[PDB]
């Protein structure tokens, strides 16, 4: 029944004032992209930074198993768009937020679907 | 220096034709640094400028392109160069990377170990290497041709680079190899390319464009490295980040270059011309299979 809960541990270390994970790989891009959350090439709009996906994944960075039956990572090999105001902590952002399944934008950071 | 808006500077052809003696590299702009855009890593900027320059060459770009990237790890445990390569290459390109030390990567597959342990069943369309041993920077010793990973790279090109394929292999004043320069004469064209963001360093990428599998020209590698240093010593390059701010035409164009299986007796001058123009890749199109040898001890 025991499982390491790294997501909870990182959220708690953040709340206690720990420095966010560094060296997430920020890409050069036009910043005129669709703004969707996780894409096959950088898609940052004017309000976002694009990062290499693997470097923004808590499980990739900590060298631990991904929390699903198949061990799959949906960031590695892709690019993640992070709101510029949140780009000091891309790992925390991807961990605390959810991608809207119909429009592909971050819930509360671009998703228009419930207006 | 209208060079400041280019991604970098390629070695002018007349410098390649000299017979210079090897001298110490003494860069005027040594110790200067370019102003990188806010939050951008040197190695992201460097690979972006390398790829911007490769966009100007006649690279073969087939469907299901195969690219391998050596020296892709960083002391940060991530792979910035791999992330730029995956941004640059057409979606669906198979990208494999590798490094002596463990790292987290966006590549389709990653091998950890000395590159000499890496074997692949298939051939490759593009080989990128950033491998580098900082212990070669000993200014107090004779600067001879280095072997180590360069010996592996030379054999890997000869055995596993598809005809028509290309390479970009990082060198510096002290990290270089004469056979690798000699191998540049086995491509339709070659250069030594210096990124504008890192122009204060003696590093360059040795680029072989469109592999022909035979010597097109005979190059003495000790002379050519001396020529490269002479060029760098007499041609200060202004550090520049300018090209990083225009990414609108960054992605490598999917040319759909033809891929053919051909036996060596069928590579005629007509085929050699197509290869030389970036219009043909010669290799099988089977599955891509890689491995790393593991030494088992107590
Ligand atoms: N014999 C060898 N076999 C495999 N790997 C090797 C070997 N000798 C050196 N190396 C590796 O070359 C890298 C140079 S620094 C790259 C930084 C980077 C690249 N792309 N983005 N950032 C180091 O990581 C280093 O371990
Ligand atoms: Zn992951
Ligand atoms: Zn939505």
Is residue A113 included in any domain, yes or no?
Answer: no
DSSP state of B7: S
Token pair 């060298």 is at which residue?
A63
CA distance B197 to B267: 40
CA distance B226 to B24: 9
Token pair 């053919």 is at which residue?
B260
Determine how many CB atoms are found less than 10 A away from the CB of residue A52: 31
Centroid of chain to Cα B142 = 25
- Residue A88 has which token pair? 């000091």
Residues within 8 A of A (CB atoms), B 42-71 only: 44-45, 48
Q: Is residue B100 exposed (0-12), middle (13-18) or buried (19+ Cβ within 10 Å)? A: middle
Identify which of B52, B91, B80, B246 has the alpha carbon closest to the alpha carbon of residue A51: B80
Is residue A49 included in any domain, yes or no?
Answer: yes
Strand spans (E) along B113-246: 118-120, 124-129, 161-171, 187-195, 204-211
Structural domain of residue A16, as residue ranges?
A: 6-96
- Name residues contacting ligand 1 (CB within 6 A): B 43, 71-74, 79-81, 99-101, 114-115, 130-133, 148-149
Largest CA distance in chain B: 59
Cβ contact (<8 Å) for A30 and B247?
A: yes
How were these coordinates obtained?
A: X-ray
Hey, is B208 helix, strand or coil? strand
Looking at the structure of chain A, the number of domains it has is 1
- Non-local (6+) Cβ contacts of B278 within 8 A are B57, B58, B59, B60, B164, B209, B210, B255, B257
- Non-local (6+) Cβ contacts of B33 within 8 A are B200, B239
How far is CA B118 from each of CA B62, B144, B255, rounded to the nearest angstrom?
Answer: 24, 26, 29
- Non-local (6+) Cβ contacts of B218 within 8 A are B182, B185
Determine how many CB atoms are found less than 10 A away from the CB of residue B197: 29
- Non-local (6+) Cβ contacts of B133 within 8 A are B148, B149, B175
> What is the tally of helices (H) and strands (E) in chain B?
7, 12
Is residue A39 included in any domain, yes or no?
Answer: yes
Q: How far apart are the first and last CA of chain A?
A: 41
Domain coordinates in residue numbering, chain B: 12-292
Is residue A48 included in any domain, yes or no?
Answer: yes
The CATH number of domain B12-292 is 3.40.50.150: yes
Q: Give me the residues near ligand 2 (ion), CB cutoff below 5 Å.
A: A 57, 59-60, 73, 76
Binding residues of A for Zn(2+) are: 57, 60, 66, 73, 100, 103, 111, 113
> What is the tally of helices (H) and strands (E) in chain A?
3, 3
Is residue A105 included in any domain, yes or no?
Answer: no
Is residue A108 included in any domain, yes or no?
Answer: no
Helix H or strand E segment including B67: strand B66-70
Cβ contact (<8 Å) for B44 and A27?
A: yes
Token pair 């808590």 is at which residue?
A58
């Amino acid at each position: 029944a025991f499982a390491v809960d790294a997501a909870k541990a990182y959220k708690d270390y953040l709340a206690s004032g720990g420095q966010p994970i560094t060296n997430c790989v920020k890409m050069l891009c036009t910043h005129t992209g669709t703004g969707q959350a996780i894409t096959v090439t950088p898609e940052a709009n004017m309000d976002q930074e694009s990062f290499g996906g693997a470097s923004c994944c808590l499980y990739c960075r900590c060298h631990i198993d991904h929390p699903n039956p198949k061990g799959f990572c949906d960031l590695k090999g892709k690019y993640v768009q992070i709101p510029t105001t949140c780009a000091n902590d891309p790992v925390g952002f991807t961990l605390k937020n959810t991608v809207c399944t119909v429009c592909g934008m971050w819930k509360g950071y671009g998703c228009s679907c419930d207006q | 220096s209208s060079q400041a808006w280019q991604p970098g500077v390629a070695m002018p052809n007349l410098y390649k034709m000299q017979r210079m003696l090897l001298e110490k590299c003494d860069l005027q702009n040594y110790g200067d640094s370019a102003t990188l855009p806010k939050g951008i890593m040197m190695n992201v900027a460097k690979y972006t400028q390398l790829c911007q320059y490769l966009n100007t060459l006649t690279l073969a770009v087939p469907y299901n392109m195969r690219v391998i990237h050596f020296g892709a790890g960083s002391d940060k445990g991530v792979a910035p160069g791999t992330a730029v390569l995956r941004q640059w290459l057409p979606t669906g390109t198979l990208l494999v990377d590798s490094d002596l030390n463990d790292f987290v990567s966006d590549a389709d597959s990653t091998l950890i170990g000395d590159c000499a342990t890496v074997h692949t069943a298939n051939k490759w369309d593009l080989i990128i290497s950033d491998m580098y041993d900082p212990k070669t920077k000993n200014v107090t010793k004779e600067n001879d041709s280095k072997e180590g990973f360069f010996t592996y790279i030379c054999g890997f090109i000869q055995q596993k680079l598809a005809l028509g394929g290309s390479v970009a292999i990082k060198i510096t004043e002290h990290s270089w190899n004469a056979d690798l320069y000699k191998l540049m004469g086995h491509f339709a064209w070659w250069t030594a390319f210096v990124t504008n963001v890192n122009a204060s360093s003696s590093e360059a990428f040795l680029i072989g464009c469109n592999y022909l599998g035979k010597p097109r020209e005979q190059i003495d590698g000790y002379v050519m490295h001396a020529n490269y240093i002479f060029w760098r010593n007499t041609n200060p390059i202004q550090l520049s980040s300018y090209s990083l701010f225009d990414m609108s035409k960054f992605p490598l164009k999917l040319r759909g270059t033809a891929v053919m299986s051909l036996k060596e007796g069928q590579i005629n001058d007509m085929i050699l011309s197509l290869l030389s123009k970036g219009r043909l890749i010669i290799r099988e199109n089977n599955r891509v299979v890689i491995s790393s040898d593991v030494l088992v001890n107590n």
